[PDB]
RNA sequence: UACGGUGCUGAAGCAACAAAUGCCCUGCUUCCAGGAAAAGCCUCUAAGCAUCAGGUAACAUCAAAUCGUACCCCAAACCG
RNA sequence: GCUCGCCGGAAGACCAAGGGUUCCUGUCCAACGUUAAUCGGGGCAGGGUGAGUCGACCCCUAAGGCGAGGCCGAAAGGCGUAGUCGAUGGGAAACAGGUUAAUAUUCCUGUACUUGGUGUUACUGCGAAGGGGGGACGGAGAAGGCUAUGUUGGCCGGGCG
RNA sequence: AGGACCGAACCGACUAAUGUUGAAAAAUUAGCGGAUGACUUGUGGCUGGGGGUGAAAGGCCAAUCAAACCGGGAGAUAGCU
RNA sequence: UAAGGUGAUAUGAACCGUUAUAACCGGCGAUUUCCGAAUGGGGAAACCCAGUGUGUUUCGACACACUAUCAUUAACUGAAUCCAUAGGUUAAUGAGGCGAACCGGGGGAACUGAAACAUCUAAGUACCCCGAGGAAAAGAAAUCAACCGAGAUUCCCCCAGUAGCGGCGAGCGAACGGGGAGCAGCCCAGAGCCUGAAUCAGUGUGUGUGUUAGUGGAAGCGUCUGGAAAGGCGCGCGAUACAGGGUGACAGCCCCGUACACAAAAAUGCACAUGCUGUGAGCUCGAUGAGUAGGGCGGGACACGUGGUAUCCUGUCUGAAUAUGGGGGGACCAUCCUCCAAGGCUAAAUACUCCUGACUGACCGAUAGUGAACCAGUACCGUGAGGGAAAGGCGAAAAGAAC
């Protein structure tokens, strides 16, 4: 699923429109991509999929916030 | 079972009658199947009578 | 002479019989529709 | 409740014999009863004595509505009414025409 | 323990037919009914001390089918298990 | 003996040659386009354990459960 | 029953499947049978089907499926490891005399035989899920051997016009 | 030896006849076309609808196809009969 | 409840019960096969087979339980790896599956109308995926309103077919505010002072008010007609009661009933005391909501077609303030006014049904009513999803034609 693993942010329905009359569905997609992080309290590295500007939040919050989004859905690292 | 019939005529035959508990029933089952003298009440003697005590004695759990 | 069907009893149980339908979403939905119609047969595999 | 039972005489108020009386010979389910001698009708069948019976075949009285029997009064030759319960005695039939109740 | 006296749950009924009244007349062979598992693991060690007789050999067959009773719907006979038991005298090795 | 079946008795029972599609045989031979695997079995060791279990020799011994079995059959018992 | 005639690699015959009492006995003729019908591959009630060894199960596996953990996919669904199933393939023991209206490599009667367990004495390292060996598997071609079989002879039983 | 010729099994249809309320929504006869091969066949599996499969015909996909079969939308819609 | 009873087709036969376990009914229980989500493991559903542990030898493993997977609460073991941890083992609990309709999230038409047809409409409907509750949703003002005021939410009636929007066409169509049904509020952003304090549950009990196996309940006869009456005739009778079930002709008085009368072992709806134990007060000072708002680019949701498009939401870039600060007030600026987003929870007016119960039936009477009155989603048909019948009524009594 192209859904944000650290925020639950999902794709959204929406159209493409022009000067012309015929219009179509588009549906917009989240930009998440892999980055390796350090889990200092476990002396180990983990690979996580994060969006642009999303790490600028985690890098000001500490990883124990993301390890609590994961644990809220019982998911392991 | 109320205390007037509780464990009477039952525990004192729990092992010592066991060598005739199924044989005496089988003997009568084989006879009640023959239709002799047209007797059908025997099906109320080989059944509806011989589980009535030991199945009220059941309280040990397990084996 | 013949007309497009086998006497094969395995092919009559393997893919539309009880265990084969009970292993599928849409097959378990047929078990419900047979119950809604009220048939005495849950499967005609035999 | 059961108003008639096996011991009291019945007048049989139906247009079946238009006189003759009897008693209940057997009590049945679903609102029926059998009354002695009321309907001893012969059936059109062979008796098959087989030199094993002297012999013949025998009539047996057949089931009728319990609502059709009615108790006999034995005082004017008419039917009577029963009723139930009294201030003395258990589950008693009251007998609506008699000043004595058990 | 090895074998319990609970195991004497063997045999269901006698049976009566001309096959036994003719073709088992010159043998000490008898016909019996048994239930679904046919007691095949315990019947021989049980029946030798249950019916006042010593057993030579035991067998059991299944009486199957006959689903017809009426011209409208179905009335099934249902399957039943019939045992042939022969009683012993002497030895034969 | 109700012969209502159910036994008793009993002859010859061998040579000649030829002969399969079956048996030797998935043989052998031959060419090519080069042609299932595993387990039983034989055997080597790992494990584990010990006057146990196993093995070698002699001898006793408990079980063979689980399913099917009638009748049809190139056929008015299958299929149309 | 006798005779005549037809087929004879089939119009003979052995057997699984799959169907479903059709096999046995009786009485029911109402329905059935592309005709009577006294008959039954008809209706109906009852009878008959026995396994250490058969073919199957266990063991092993192809194509392929199923598939914890793991993974892709809004989702339905799919992928796939550890494992696990599976035949049209590979693996332990079976043959046939007796016969009843109808039963039988199953009972009866003989003979053959394999796998798993229990245990003693004497002496004593046994053993896998692993390793090896084997299992083991292209399609034709060409001699030889052999046997139920073929066809006479002899023998016993009968025939001799 | 044989993508040779004969030919039964098997596979397949050049002609003439029969059959299409026929025994039968593909079967029959008489002469046959092939017949160790790009063969054919028993058995199972894998592939599905705007997709499969096809020495590839709007052919085949269970009598069905310029989108099959079943159900739902559905009492479709019809300046017309 | 009941002298009856061993169910129907059912005859026949053997037995039972009436003080001492009758059958039957209502409540309270006992045991609870195999397959199925199916789950120790497998498979061609009702079959075949493991591991582990406790008891036991009578010394062939007999007897009896537990054991999918993930998550949670937590141990045992543990590789690379040192301690650790992946992996593995186990226990305890939860989830799974099925169910009528409404509901929340994801996916989502065509025909139809626009008298064509492509925006619009049909319609977020039909249908498919998932989840969940008694409702979901919504909620205790970043509400509006308009300088005057109201004061959580929702549903019904109005506002108004007006103001709006619109291939300006078909259509779509409010707000503010008014009339009702219905009105509970709380928790985190920590933790000291104070305490177990309305309220809910688990487990136990009692009372009241309903539901219930149940129990009593009036009178019509005589006679004629007829095979048979309740008709007719004669003389009546009960009237709190003439509702109608019917029963063997036109029954208030035959029975079943009606009007009315009666009662609670125990279970159970509701409301409430209360025992235990868990849960929840009172009070105060701090903390104090950020990739969040705002602004662009692309769009959604708004009656509203993007226009001047605010609001609410946002895929994506940019991006703060932090309370002389932030939001909205229909682009926007200025002033003024009023709320304070970026955490969560919740009473019932409303939506809804397979089911359960009552209440009403100028609905039907066998080519009527559902496919259905005849052991009919049964026969019957199809490979399967799926489609699906034909067929009533002798009598009071089988007395169903003996001889």
Swiss-Prot record, chain A:
Protein name: Large ribosomal subunit protein bL28
Keywords attached to this entry: Ribonucleoprotein, Ribosomal protein, RNA-binding, rRNA-binding
PANTHER family given in the database record: 39S RIBOSOMAL PROTEIN L28, MITOCHONDRIAL, LARGE RIBOSOMAL SUBUNIT PROTEIN BL28M
Species for this entry: Escherichia coli (strain K12)
Gene3D superfamilies: Ribosomal protein L28/L24 (2.30.170.40)
Record-linked InterPro entries: Ribosomal_bL28, Ribosomal_bL28/bL31-like_sf, Ribosomal_bL28_bact-type, Ribosomal_bL28_sf
Domain of life: Bacteria
GO cellular component, one term: cytosolic large ribosomal subunit
Swiss-Prot record, chain B:
Gene3D superfamilies, per the entry: 6.10.140.1970
Pfam families reported in the protein's UniProt record: Ribosomal_L29 (PF00831)
Record's GO cellular component terms: cytoplasm; cytosolic large ribosomal subunit
Entry keyword set: Ribonucleoprotein, Ribosomal protein, RNA-binding, rRNA-binding
Any single biological process term in GO: cytoplasmic translation
UniProt-listed SUPFAM superfamilies: Ribosomal protein L29 (L29p) (SSF46561)
InterPro entries: Ribosomal_protein_uL29, Ribosomal_uL29, Ribosomal_uL29_CS, Ribosomal_uL29_sf
Phenotype caused by lack of the gene: Cells missing both S17 and L29 grow very slowly and have a rather unstable temperature-sensitive phenotype.
Role according to the record: Binds 23S rRNA. It is not essential for growth. One of the proteins that surrounds the polypeptide exit tunnel on the outside of the subunit. Contacts trigger factor.
HAMAP family assigned to the protein according to its UniProt record, in alphabetical order: Ribosomal_uL29
Family, similarity comment: Belongs to the universal ribosomal protein uL29 family.
Record note on quaternary structure: Part of the 50s ribosomal subunit. Contacts protein L23, trigger factor and protein nascent chains. Might also contact SecE and probably does contact SecG when the SecYEG translocation complex is docked with the ribosome.
Protein name, as recorded: Large ribosomal subunit protein uL29
Higher taxonomy: Bacteria, Pseudomonadati, Pseudomonadota, Gammaproteobacteria, Enterobacterales
Underlying gene: rpmC
Swiss-Prot record, chain C:
PROSITE patterns assigned: RIBOSOMAL_L34
Keyword Ribosomal protein: yes
Annotated InterPro entries: Ribosomal_bL34, Ribosomal_bL34_CS
GO function terms (MF aspect): structural constituent of ribosome
GO CC term, one of those recorded: cytosolic large ribosomal subunit
Keywords annotated in UniProt: Ribonucleoprotein, Ribosomal protein
SS bonds (residue pairs): none
Keyword Ribosomal protein: yes
Gene3D superfamilies associated with the record: 1.10.287.3980
One family name in Pfam for this protein: Ribosomal_L34
Biological process (GO), any one: cytoplasmic translation
Membership in a protein family: Belongs to the bacterial ribosomal protein bL34 family.
Subunit details: Part of the 50S ribosomal subunit.
Matches recorded under NCBIfam families: rpmH_bact (TIGR01030)
This protein's name: Large ribosomal subunit protein bL34
Taxonomic source organism: Escherichia coli (strain K12)
The encoding gene: rpmH
Swiss-Prot record, chain D:
Signal peptide segment: none
MF (Gene Ontology): large ribosomal subunit rRNA binding; structural constituent of ribosome
InterPro entries for this protein: KOW, Rib_uL2_dom2, Ribosomal_uL24, Ribosomal_uL24_CS, Ribosomal_uL24_KOW, Translation_prot_SH3-like_sf
Domain of life: Bacteria
Gene Ontology biological-process entries: cytoplasmic translation; ribosomal large subunit assembly; translation
Listed CDD domains: KOW_RPL26
Pfam families membership: KOW, ribosomal_L24
Keyword Transferase: no
Keywords, sorted A to Z: Ribonucleoprotein, Ribosomal protein, RNA-binding, rRNA-binding
One GO CC annotation: cytosolic large ribosomal subunit
Family affiliation: Belongs to the universal ribosomal protein uL24 family.
Assembly mode: Part of the 50S ribosomal subunit. Might contact the SecYEG translocation complex when it is docked with the ribosome.
Function according to Swiss-Prot or TrEMBL: One of two assembly initiator proteins, it binds directly to the 5'-end of the 23S rRNA, where it nucleates assembly of the 50S subunit. It is not thought to be involved in the functions of the mature 50S subunit in vitro.
NCBIfam families listed in its UniProt record: rplX_bact (TIGR01079)
Name under which the protein is recorded: Large ribosomal subunit protein uL24
Species of origin: Escherichia coli (strain K12)
Gene name of the record: rplX
């Amino acid at each position: 699923s192209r859904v944000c693993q650290v925020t639950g942010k999902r794709p959204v329905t929406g159209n493409n429109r022009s000067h012309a009359l015929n219009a179509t569905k588009r549906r917009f997609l989240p930009n998440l991509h892999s980055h390796r992080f350090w889990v200092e309290s476990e002396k180990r590295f983990v690979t996580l999929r994060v969006s642009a500007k999303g790490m600028r939040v985690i890098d000001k919050k500490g990883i124990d916030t993301v390890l609590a989004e994961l644990r809220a859905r019982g998911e392991k690292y | 079972m109320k205390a007037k019939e509780l464990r009477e005529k039952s525990v004192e035959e729990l092992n010592t009658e066991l060598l005739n508990l199924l044989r005496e029933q089988f003997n009568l089952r084989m006879q009640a199947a023959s239709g002799q003298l047209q007797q059908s009440h025997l099906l109320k003697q080989v059944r509806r009578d011989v589980a009535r005590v030991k199945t009220l004695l059941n309280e040990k759990a397990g084996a | 002479m013949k007309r497009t069907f086998q006497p094969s009893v395995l092919k009559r149980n393997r893919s539309h019989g009880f265990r084969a339908r009970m292993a599928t979403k849409n097959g378990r939905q047929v078990l419900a529709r047979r119950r809604a119609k009220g048939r005495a047969r849950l499967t005609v595999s035999k | 409740a059961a108003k008639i039972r096996r011991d009291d005489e019945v007048i049989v108020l139906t247009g079946k014999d238009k006189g003759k009386r009897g008693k209940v010979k057997n009590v049945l389910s679903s609102g029926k009863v059998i009354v002695e001698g009321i309907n001893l009708v012969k059936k059109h069948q062979k008796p098959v004595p087989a030199l094993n019976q002297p012999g013949g075949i025998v009539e047996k009285e057949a089931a009728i509505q319990v609502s059709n029997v009615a108790i006999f009064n034995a005082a004017t030759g008419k039917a009577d009414r029963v009723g139930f319960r009294f201030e003395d005695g258990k589950k008693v039939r009251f007998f609506k025409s008699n000043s004595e109740t058990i | 323990m090895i074998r319990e006296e609970r195991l004497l749950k063997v045999l269901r009924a006698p049976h009566v037919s001309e096959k036994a009244s003719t073709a088992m007349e010159k043998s000490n062979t008898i016909v019996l009914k048994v239930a679904k598992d046919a007691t095949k693991a315990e019947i021989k060690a049980a029946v030798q001390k249950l019916f006042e007789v010593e057993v030579e050999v035991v067998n059991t067959l299944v009486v199957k089918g006959k689903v017809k009773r009426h011209g409208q719907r179905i009335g099934r006979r249902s399957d039943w298990k019939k045992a042939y038991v022969t009683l012993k005298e002497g030895q034969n090795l």
